[PDB]
Structure formats: C-alpha cells, structure tokens
Design an enzyme around this catalytic site. Sequence first.
Site, short mmCIF file in Angstrom:
data_model
loop_
_atom_site.label_atom_id
_atom_site.label_comp_id
_atom_site.label_asym_id
_atom_site.label_seq_id
_atom_site.Cartn_x
_atom_site.Cartn_y
_atom_site.Cartn_z
N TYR A 106 -8.69 -23.75 26.61
CA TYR A 106 -9.77 -24.22 25.74
C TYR A 106 -9.34 -24.16 24.28
CZ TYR A 106 -12.59 -23.83 29.94
OH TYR A 106 -13.09 -23.98 31.22
N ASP A 120 -8.68 -24.28 40.26
CA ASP A 120 -8.84 -22.83 40.28
C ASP A 120 -10.27 -22.45 40.62
OD1 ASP A 120 -6.18 -22.41 39.62
OD2 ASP A 120 -6.58 -22.23 37.47
#
Lengths: 357, 357, 149
Positions: free
Chosen positions: B122, B237
């Site tokens: 991020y 994930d």
Amino acid sequence: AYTTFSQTKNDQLKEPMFFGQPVNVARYDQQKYDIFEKLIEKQLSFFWRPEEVDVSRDRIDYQALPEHEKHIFISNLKYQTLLDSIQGRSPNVALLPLISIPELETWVETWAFSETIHSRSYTHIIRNIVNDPSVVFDDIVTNEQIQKRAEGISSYYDELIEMTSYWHLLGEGTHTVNGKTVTVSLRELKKKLYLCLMSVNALEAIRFYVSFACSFAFAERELMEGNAKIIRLIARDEALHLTGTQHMLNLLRSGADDPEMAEIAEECKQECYDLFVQAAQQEKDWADYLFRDGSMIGLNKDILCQYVEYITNIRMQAVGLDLPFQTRSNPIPWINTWLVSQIDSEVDTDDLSNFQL
Amino acid sequence: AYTTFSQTKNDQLKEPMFFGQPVNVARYDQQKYDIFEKLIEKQLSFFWRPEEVDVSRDRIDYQALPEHEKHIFISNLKYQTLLDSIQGRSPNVALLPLISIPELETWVETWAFSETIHSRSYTHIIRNIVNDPSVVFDDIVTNEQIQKRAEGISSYYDELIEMTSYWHLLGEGTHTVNGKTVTVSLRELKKKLYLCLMSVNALEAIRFYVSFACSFAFAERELMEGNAKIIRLIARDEALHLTGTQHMLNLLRSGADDPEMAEIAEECKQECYDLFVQAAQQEKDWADYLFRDGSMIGLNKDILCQYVEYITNIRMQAVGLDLPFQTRSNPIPWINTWLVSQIDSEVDTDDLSNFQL
Amino acid sequence: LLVTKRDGSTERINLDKIHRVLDWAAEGLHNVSISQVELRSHIQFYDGIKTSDIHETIIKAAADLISRDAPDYQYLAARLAIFHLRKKAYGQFEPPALYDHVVKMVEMGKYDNHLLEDYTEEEFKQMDTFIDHDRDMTFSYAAVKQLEG
Ligand SMILES: Nc1ncnc2c1ncn2[C@H]1C[C@H](O)[C@@H](COP(=O)(O)OP(=O)(O)O)O1
Ligand SMILES: [Mg+2]
C-alpha cells in the site's frame, strides 16, 4: 490498556521505540530509525524455503559417522530446534505490545516470521537424517543439559510479558490484587525490557554461533553438506537478527530514544555483564558435554571453548560491555567462509650518445 | 501465567487449538489439523514483493482520472491500508498467547507476516501515484469517515487481549483488583475468542472483498493496472486467510476440538449473526461515502451494495449462519477473473433395387 | 578402525594424538589454528593407514596456510617437519649421541671414515656438549624442506 489501533493521531517520527503510543497506521515511506527498514528489506531479499535445498545425501553421511559424532550432531540440532522455537514466538509476544514506531513493529514480525522458517528447516533436516523424528523432538523438552538454559532464556521473556500485562491492565502505581500489594513501575518495566534484549542478543550472537561452529565443522569435512547449506542460510538471517538487537540496545543505552533509559541502562550494566558471562559459561559447559565421548577433526572442547571466549568478547564490546575474557585471535578462521558472502624495438642513438662512460 | 517455553512435555497432537498448554517445541513433522500446514506451505509458495510489480503507468492514469474517481480510488486505498494495519499486528498479539498447537501457531505468524507485505505494498502504491504520501497516511487517522470502523474491528481484538491478560495474571476465579471485583471466566474468554474470530472472518471474507471490487473495476477499464496486479496478489493471500478462520470457526463450532466450545458457539449464534450483518451494513455505509461525489462505469452504490449482500450470504453460510439477505446472483460476474489462478462416390445398385417406391 | 604405527604395529585411531602434536607445534605462536590445520588436511582415513602418511599430510596443510595474515605458520609447519625428520632418521624424537651416530654412519658408508681416525671417542663426546638440538626449533618451514630435500 493495549489497543490494536490507537485512535489518537500521533507523529510516529517523534515516538520512542518502546512504551509510547501503540502504532496505528502502518506506513513505510519514512522512519525514525532507518536501520530497521534496512533490516526488513535485507530479510525480505533473503527469503528462502527449506525444501529448496537438497538434503538427500545427508542421511548417508550421518549413518556413517561414529556414534559420538552422531551425538554431537544431534545434540547441536536439538539445541538449535529449542532456541529457534523460543525465538519463533517470543519477539512477537514480548515486543509487539510495547513497540510504538511502525518500522520496528514490522521488523519484529519479520524477525519472528523468519524464525519459523528456521524451525521448519530443522524439521526438514531431522526428517532426512534420522528414521524417527519423534525420537529427537520428544527429547528436547526433557533434556537435562538443554532444559537448564531453556528456562533461563525463557524467563527473561516471561518476566517481561508479565510486567507488560500488569502495565496494560493496571497502569503505573501501587495496586491491590487479592489482598497482596502490587507495584507497577514503568522504570522497572524498562529494566525488564533492557535485560531481555540483552539476553536475546547473547542468545543470537553467542549461543547460536557456538552452534554454527559445530554444524560448519562437519561441512569442512564435506559431510552433512545439505544441513550446512541450510545452516548457512540461517546464519545469514542470524546476522540480521543480532544487528537488530544491537541497534535496539545501543539506542536505549545512548539515551537517544528515552532520556530516562540511558540512566536505567547504566544501573543494569553489572547485571548485563553477568548475563553474558553466564551465557558464555553455559556454552562452555555445553561443549564439555558435546565432546565427553570424543572429538572430531577440527573441533574439540578446547577449540570450541576458545571460540566461545573469542565470540563473546566481540559481542559484548558491540553493546558497550567490559570484555570478560583475554584477547584472542579467531581459533576457527574457516567459519568466516560460512558467515559472509613484445618489445618496442625503436632506439634513438642520439639519446644514447648523451651517455658518458 | 504465559510461558514462552512450557517445561511440561505434552503430546501436542492431543492439545486443543486454543487455551491448552502453551506451545513449547516447534515441530512440523506431524499435525493435529493438517489444514494449517497446507495453509503455511501455500502462503510461503505465494511469497511476492511489491517492488517487483511495475506501477509506473499508474501515476499517469490516476492523475488523468476525474476528481470523483480519484476519491473512489484513494478512499478505497486508505481503507485497505487501515484494515491490513490492524491485521498486521493483531493476529500476533491476540492469538499467540492462546494457541496450544504448533501448526496453528506458525500459521498465525505466517498469516501476520503476509499482512505486513500487504501494508508495504500500500505504501508502494501510494508513493508511486501521489506527490506527498504523508497527505494520504495522515488522513487515515484524521478523516472521520474512515476511523469509525477502526473501532468496530479493533474492539473485538482489544477485549480478547485484555481478558487474556487477566486470565494469565490471576487465573480463573473471582478476584478483587483495587477494591473493584473482577471475575475471570474461561468460558467468557472462549466466548470472546470465538466472537473475535467471527469478526476477523467477516473482515477478510467480506470487508476486503468489497474493496477488491473497486480496485478490479478500474482494471476492467484498463486503468490503474499496476495497482490491480498488486491487489490480485493480495486477494490470493486473502483467500488463504479467510480459509484459515473458516476452519478455526467450524472446528470450534462442531465441538471436534473442544466439547465446551460447541456449547459456547451455540450461545453466540445470535451474537455472531448480528456481528456479520452489522459488518455488511457498515460496508454498505462505506459504499455511500465512496460514491458521494459520483460513480464510474460498472460500479455505483447500488451495484456495490448488491455485491455486499451477495458475498455476505456466501460467507455466513460457510460458517453455519443464517442468510440475512435475499438470494441473488453475482451482480459483478467479471470479478471472478481476478479472484482465482468430402463425399464417398460409392453406390450399390443391388442395395437400391431392394427398395420399394 | 586401525592405523599403522612407525614400528609396524597397529592400534585404533585416536584423534587426540593429532590434537596433542598440533598443540605442541602451535605453542607460543600467534594467529594459528589447530582446527584449520586438521580441516585443511582433508585426511582420508582408511583401515591400516600409515601414521607417517598422516603426519606428512598435516605438514603440507600447515605449510600451505603460510600467509601475510598468519605468518607464524612458517614455524608451526617447521616444528612438525622437524618432528617428522627426527622420527625418520632415529625412530624417536631425541637424537642419539654424536659418537654412536658417527660410528653407525661410517659403517653404513654414509660418512667419511676419516672422522673416526681424526677424532677420538672422548672428543666426539666433547662436541656433543657443543650441540644445542633446540636450534632445530629456530628454522622456518622453507629451511626444513631444503634440509630434507
Ligand atoms: N592412533 C592414532 N590415530 C591417529 N593419528 C595418530 C595416532 N597415533 C599417532 N598419530 C599421529 C600423531 C603424529 O602427528 C603422527 C605420527 O607421529 P609419531 O608420534 O611419530 O607416530 P607414532 O606414534 O605412530 O610412532 O601420527
Ligand atoms: Mg607417537
């Protein structure tokens, strides 16, 4: 109390390493101490898996070893499984509730995660060297020579975890818990952290490197070469781990992070020195147990004990402690291999005529 | 109290998932539940790094977006940074002091470690699209529209962490702490864990997948394709993470792991149902903030709220809860792409004459 | 497994014999490593391996460790080589008396017989008091290899 996402907006660059406001937003564009960002990047770049190393021809070598050399190898492997078992969970449980800057929070989780790869590789090594891995694993908790140090090492963690829970539940002050009086001191909590980090530093910078000497000595004889490749990967990670605790300790000791901390670290200097000296003494006794039935080419009680004194002096100086042993040269220099990686024919007669014979 | 290496030699195959004896030796040659061993192996094989993904085009696309579409992208990016900030540390802090089998202990740390890669990506995305990442990160904590649900998720974590500390310090019973009387109930502690795991499941199986729809909607228009490559790896994930909590919840609910737990899961069935529905309502509320300034091709408040109800029913049924919304087909079927992986001349006159016209 | 001693007899392998001889050769030296010498020997033990081949192997290993960082290996290898040369000529470490040696060597035709004609036994024993066999401990390795070669 501890919160997983503190509601207060704080400047994370101005927080201390420990005991400040719990980290809320995880950002990696800026750091108070960039050493932990470098440690993360270095660790992420080292990512390895045990199964990607060929350990198939290690079983042949192990079965061919003498009986007392099987004992040396397996005792060292049991001790490694123990230490990285503690290291798998303990940095997460003990340090995450105290960390107040994001780069150190993420490093501890990356540090702890890489230890689980180490534990997985020990099972991988064991599964390919012995016939019943249960024989090895069941002996780790009851082993008389190992358990004395397992409780010693884990106690520094356990005491830090306990005071941290009291500090989150009750806060600082004098409290009454079921009649008995309980005093929660932040200054005493900072002392239990500093001693714990010192114990962890000696664990990763001394105890494991004494264990590396045993693993890599077999590889210098071109034996157990699959195990040695994995231990080489572990040793590369281990260098990062001890660098982290070194920077944590020196930052706390220097008072850069907390003015109170520099004074507290001085009151512990004698206890930390005794902590390292005891750690060195325990490993010497461990070497005395390893070679009780005989030695091997390149390694015996004297050689390994000399390495204990050599490696301890280096580590203690790195964290500003007095040297307990005599100055010495590296007794096993081979271990460094595993821890770091047409004539010009023109003549001028006029120039020669300038010569006066 | 909690110990980082319990000195009791116990058969880890017979311990429960939680509240048993703290894990001592980390071994991976045997599992009580092999689902967590498969999840570890699968997560390690998915290991990826954000910097190995090309995001250079994404700065141009983002700056070219309409302003109200900048709002959608960056608000969804801030919300993702928030959730995986909690997920980075919380499974480690909240679950490790409770886990009593090694394969589940290591999975929680692998789970938590993979979340730090998400948080790092991020930052990687943000720093490559805006000029000052500080403007974005500081707004996560100060924007009143984002922070309100930080309280929702973190409260389930925080309460479990607090009761866990009381349970380790005082043990089960009725205690008096500074006058006020404090009751430590193991049944109430198991109830706070089950509620917490339910909240985390709704976080990763509902809250994040609503967020994936926004990122992948931009990619269906061939915009922000570098971000979409990263979100696809994160979503892969996330599929492992929600599978982990689903197995934990169903194993606890069925009473296979702990008989006492099945009774507790029945007392919470209504509280868990209200927890999941509230999570969906909050995501509907979040969608109202994303599109307050306008919508985009393929996604608006109506479409996204339909996806919330669509995905909630699927997740709640997976954990044995009643469906709160009406049955509906997938309102954005395109999102599944991102969440997985001469003549024969012969004549016979005799045969023809045997024919009657 | 068994090794073959210099006298021809056999006994089972004992690495302490190698440790002791190396500790003696490294006494007083700086920046040398008993461990390094044994590991660089790469000695392949087989049942019945000659004990003299073992010693020659660890001489070459210590001799090849001579470097700028550890110059004292020049004396460790020399002491090992002197020890080896003592055994080859005498079967033991301590050399015999000068007279007893000269008599045996003239009879074997290796020395000139004029030594026994120009010097009496009392004179040979007097020159034995001049000799200091500890001066073999002042050579470097290159010196000893030229001596034996
Ligand atoms: N049993 C044994 N196993 C292995 N090495 C041995 C040994 N006994 C002696 N050695 C080593 C030590 C010396 O460095 C080398 C030969 O030294 P030596 O003392 O002249 O031989 P020996 O004792 O056989 O007469 O062999
Ligand atoms: Mg001898």
